[PDB]
Design a protein around this motif. Structure first.
Motif, PDB file in Angstrom:
ATOM      1  N   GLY C 125     -12.462  14.369  -4.471  1.00  0.00           N
ATOM      2  CA  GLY C 125     -11.419  13.484  -4.008  1.00  0.00           C
ATOM      3  C   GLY C 125     -11.967  12.163  -3.494  1.00  0.00           C
ATOM      4  O   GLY C 125     -13.170  11.883  -3.517  1.00  0.00           O
ATOM      5  N   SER C 126     -11.042  11.326  -3.030  1.00  0.00           N
ATOM      6  CA  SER C 126     -11.378   9.969  -2.630  1.00  0.00           C
ATOM      7  C   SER C 126     -10.557   9.571  -1.414  1.00  0.00           C
ATOM      8  O   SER C 126      -9.464  10.098  -1.177  1.00  0.00           O
ATOM      9  CB  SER C 126     -11.150   8.952  -3.781  1.00  0.00           C
ATOM     10  OG  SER C 126      -9.791   8.944  -4.192  1.00  0.00           O
ATOM     11  N   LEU C 127     -11.108   8.626  -0.659  1.00  0.00           N
ATOM     12  CA  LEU C 127     -10.483   8.024   0.507  1.00  0.00           C
ATOM     13  C   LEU C 127     -10.916   6.568   0.599  1.00  0.00           C
ATOM     14  O   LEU C 127     -12.015   6.210   0.170  1.00  0.00           O
ATOM     15  CB  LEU C 127     -10.922   8.714   1.805  1.00  0.00           C
ATOM     16  CG  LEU C 127     -10.452  10.128   2.096  1.00  0.00           C
ATOM     17  CD1 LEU C 127     -11.224  10.636   3.305  1.00  0.00           C
ATOM     18  CD2 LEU C 127      -8.960  10.157   2.345  1.00  0.00           C
ATOM     19  N   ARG C 128     -10.073   5.741   1.208  1.00  0.00           N
ATOM     20  CA  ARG C 128     -10.459   4.386   1.571  1.00  0.00           C
ATOM     21  C   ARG C 128     -10.402   4.274   3.087  1.00  0.00           C
ATOM     22  O   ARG C 128      -9.348   4.485   3.686  1.00  0.00           O
ATOM     23  CB  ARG C 128      -9.556   3.329   0.929  1.00  0.00           C
ATOM     24  CG  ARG C 128     -10.143   1.908   1.013  1.00  0.00           C
ATOM     25  CD  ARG C 128      -9.197   0.787   0.468  1.00  0.00           C
ATOM     26  NE  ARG C 128      -7.993   0.619   1.280  1.00  0.00           N
ATOM     27  CZ  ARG C 128      -7.174  -0.431   1.218  1.00  0.00           C
ATOM     28  NH1 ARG C 128      -7.445  -1.477   0.452  1.00  0.00           N
ATOM     29  NH2 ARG C 128      -6.061  -0.436   1.951  1.00  0.00           N
ATOM     30  N   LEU C 129     -11.533   3.964   3.702  1.00  0.00           N
ATOM     31  CA  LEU C 129     -11.571   3.701   5.129  1.00  0.00           C
ATOM     32  C   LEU C 129     -11.450   2.207   5.361  1.00  0.00           C
ATOM     33  O   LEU C 129     -11.996   1.406   4.603  1.00  0.00           O
ATOM     34  CB  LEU C 129     -12.872   4.206   5.748  1.00  0.00           C
ATOM     35  CG  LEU C 129     -13.234   5.652   5.435  1.00  0.00           C
ATOM     36  CD1 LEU C 129     -14.442   5.983   6.307  1.00  0.00           C
ATOM     37  CD2 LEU C 129     -12.074   6.595   5.718  1.00  0.00           C
ATOM     38  N   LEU C 190     -14.340   0.876   3.219  1.00  0.00           N
ATOM     39  CA  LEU C 190     -15.305   1.739   2.552  1.00  0.00           C
ATOM     40  C   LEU C 190     -14.521   2.592   1.562  1.00  0.00           C
ATOM     41  O   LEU C 190     -13.782   3.493   1.967  1.00  0.00           O
ATOM     42  CB  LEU C 190     -16.085   2.600   3.552  1.00  0.00           C
ATOM     43  CG  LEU C 190     -17.206   3.400   2.867  1.00  0.00           C
ATOM     44  CD1 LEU C 190     -18.328   2.499   2.413  1.00  0.00           C
ATOM     45  CD2 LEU C 190     -17.742   4.497   3.785  1.00  0.00           C
ATOM     46  N   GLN C 191     -14.621   2.264   0.283  1.00  0.00           N
ATOM     47  CA  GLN C 191     -13.985   3.086  -0.748  1.00  0.00           C
ATOM     48  C   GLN C 191     -14.891   4.279  -0.996  1.00  0.00           C
ATOM     49  O   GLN C 191     -16.036   4.101  -1.413  1.00  0.00           O
ATOM     50  CB  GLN C 191     -13.786   2.302  -2.042  1.00  0.00           C
ATOM     51  CG  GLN C 191     -13.110   3.110  -3.169  1.00  0.00           C
ATOM     52  CD  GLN C 191     -11.705   3.546  -2.800  1.00  0.00           C
ATOM     53  OE1 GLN C 191     -10.945   2.795  -2.182  1.00  0.00           O
ATOM     54  NE2 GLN C 191     -11.366   4.779  -3.136  1.00  0.00           N
ATOM     55  N   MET C 192     -14.426   5.480  -0.702  1.00  0.00           N
ATOM     56  CA  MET C 192     -15.270   6.667  -0.872  1.00  0.00           C
ATOM     57  C   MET C 192     -14.760   7.524  -2.024  1.00  0.00           C
ATOM     58  O   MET C 192     -13.714   8.163  -1.901  1.00  0.00           O
ATOM     59  CB  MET C 192     -15.330   7.500   0.404  1.00  0.00           C
ATOM     60  CG  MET C 192     -15.772   6.751   1.652  1.00  0.00           C
ATOM     61  SD  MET C 192     -15.222   7.629   3.136  1.00  0.00           S
ATOM     62  CE  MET C 192     -16.414   8.951   3.065  1.00  0.00           C
TER      63      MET C 192
END
Ligand SMILES: [Cl-]
Ligand SMILES: [Cl-]
Ligand SMILES: [Cl-]
Ligand SMILES: [Cl-]
Ligand SMILES: [Cl-]
Ligand SMILES: [Cl-]
Ligand SMILES: [Cl-]
Ligand code: NA
Ligand code: NA
Lengths: 223, 228, 226, 226
Positions: C125-129, C190-192
């Protein structure tokens, strides 16, 4: 006319590390200061006398210094046999005193048991063994216990991938071993606790038809 | 590149002690080394930069040193607010790295009043735990002893109390029939037997000593998690 | 036979402000009311007992009052170390109770960093901080992301340069994370992507200064599990 | 379906000694036998597996043997780090068992101090401790008593001077304890009167050397309790 304050009271370092222990003399100061090493269960052994002289036979990575009121023991490259409690001593013409002592402790595959404590007979208790550095789903895991002053006693094992269980006759029908692969943790569920269950409980990883990695253990005292 | 090795990984000390923490740079070395303090639940705070420059507002008992590859943080006289974890940091022109950390813990403590709870852990609903609170610097035979709990992000909640000399016990309604408080004067220890745990019992459990119709000394607390 | 209603549940004030917190005793009443301070991650500390007695070592700017069923804690001039949560306690001969607590918090000008965007994802998966900055021009500084896995140390994640947005990454996140910044909105990101269980950590954003990181945000928690 | 009987239960030996420990499998037998070393307060460490295979990093002075049902661990030359307890382990397809353990203990050089007289008394009782010296003339040395309460540090108790029998005491025992010696019989004594709970401790006798205490006995336990 003398008083010594020793610091730190304990420290954890790794093999090869440089470790310093200090003793501050807060009254009369002289060079009549000695350092001792004490292993668990044994009497102290002299390391250094006259604040800086190496005692015959003591390894050269131990050394002692004085700067003003501060006396320092330095272990230059910490070795596994160095793990012990260290004491400073100061002498006057009329009195002797000791510092309070410093415990020097150790510390990749790792096992940490938790859950132990003083507990009442008849109750139940869950022990945990948290694994790191390997996936314990792929290994047999073992619980082995040791009552105070006594020998090792195998308790239970659980198999890789299929969670088959094996038990000592002494705990069959009372203890259940299990594991949470998602949590990389093994468990021991102890029922109908009794005085024979008082012990240090170790979790160990299978290898070579043997147990190659062990946790430090958790103490369960039933009373 | 850079790499830092911090030692010790932990030490216990008392207020008034001089404490020293070392970081060895095993590769490139410059004086671009910094030290941070971190308290539990909190962000790190900068103590020292350029190996020896004290950051504004940091007490002068913190000093930073260098000898070749070896960088040292010294606290000349440990104060109660100094117990924390400490990190060194090294910077290159292309990379940043931190030491593994040194925890500075409070020693235990001599004749100073101290309470240390233990026994916390994770349990399934319906499970049970027995907390202990070990007293130092006073005899709990002469004092009321309390247990107080705090669910994460929520308020203080009194759990139970036990009286001196007579062992009379008192309980919050939320734990009646499930928790039992007791004390062992010969071990100078108080206990909380927790049966039939449910999810709402998840909390930090503090033991506290009675004084002045209030609770004057408190432990650090032990975490209990009840989760299916 | 005792019950305490504490008010307000939170308040924002500045250093130097006079702050008052009330607890109303809704049932039996006595002088046996105490007040405590608690900071994040620490046990409570006793401030006042018997409604008005100042506990030894507590600064005189703290005082306790009573009028009828209402007990009040007054901080005559708030100091930076006084931002915390405060609780009243009442005792009877059979019970203890605590008020629900009052968080005293800070409110411009001051440097602040506020992370957001953390949450729970599955592997892959992915998250943007995001890291919202105020009190300074983010475009003029290096910004960093640093993370800390539970129970473990600090690990540098990524940095972005001022004025040119050059990027730098730890080996452990190369090809998966991207740092960037919107200078017109004074926010770093921070695009993770391609998350894995080992990325589970609190993620801090920090400002560069003096060859170090002088200001940090409070962090945002990221959890990766299947 | 497996059972191990281990012998000896303990043995005393010196550095440089060859030492052998035996485990007899009295039920089903196979090569699935391992040997472990354990030091006080530490977990077992694996030495030998499959009856004769040396685990990685174990010194070559350790070796394992089998003769029929009997399995033997041999230490070809005892080193200071080898004094420990040793265990054999047998596995089947359904069960594991351990031998009862063998304690390998240091023998005693010429210098020995042996404390005796420790025991249990009620508060207000008395005890006399004895320290028997050999390998040196007690008359020519300072002798010391030093104690250690369970889990606490060393505390000096008393000293007696050579040739003139001057005595020195810690404040904590002043007016209750008396140190003495019988030089003709190479024995030192500690008369302990008016005992209290805080005197509970292991009591060590020690010989003065070089402004310090160069030789210690193994100590004798004193327990004071109502
Ligand atoms: Cl079973
Ligand atoms: Cl229990
Ligand atoms: Cl209920
Ligand atoms: Cl109100
Ligand atoms: Cl007052
Ligand atoms: Cl003030
Ligand atoms: Cl910058
Ligand atoms: Na996204
Ligand atoms: Na006395």
């Amino acid at each position: 006319d003398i008083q010594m304050t020793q610091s730190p009271s304990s420290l954890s370092a790794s093999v090869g590390d440089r470790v310093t222990i200090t003793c501050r003399a807060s009254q009369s100061v002289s060079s009549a200061v000695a350092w001792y090493q004490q292993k668990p269960g044994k009497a102290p052994k002299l390391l250094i006398y006259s604040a800086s002289s190496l005692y015959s036979g003591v390894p050269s990575r131990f050394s002692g210094s004085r700067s003003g009121t501060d006396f320092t023991l330095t272990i230059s490259s910490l070795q596994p046999e160095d793990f012990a409690t260290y004491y400073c001593q100061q002498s006057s013409y009329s009195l002797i005193t000791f510092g309070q002592g410093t415990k020097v402790e150790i510390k990749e595959v790792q096992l940490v048991e938790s859950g132990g404590g003083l507990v009442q007979p008849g109750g139940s208790l869950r022990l945990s063994c948290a694994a790191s550095g390997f996936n314990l789903r792929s290994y047999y895991m073992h619980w082995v216990r040791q009552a105070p002053g006594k020998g090792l006693e195998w308790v239970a094992s659980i198999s890789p991938y299929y969670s088959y269980t094996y038990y000592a006759d002494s705990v069959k029908g009372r203890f259940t071993i299990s594991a949470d692969t998602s949590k990389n943790t093994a468990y021991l569920q102890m029922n109908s606790l009794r005085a024979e269950d008082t012990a240090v409980y170790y979790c160990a990883r299978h290898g070579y038809g043997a147990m190659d990695y062990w946790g430090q253990g958790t103490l369960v005292t039933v009373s």
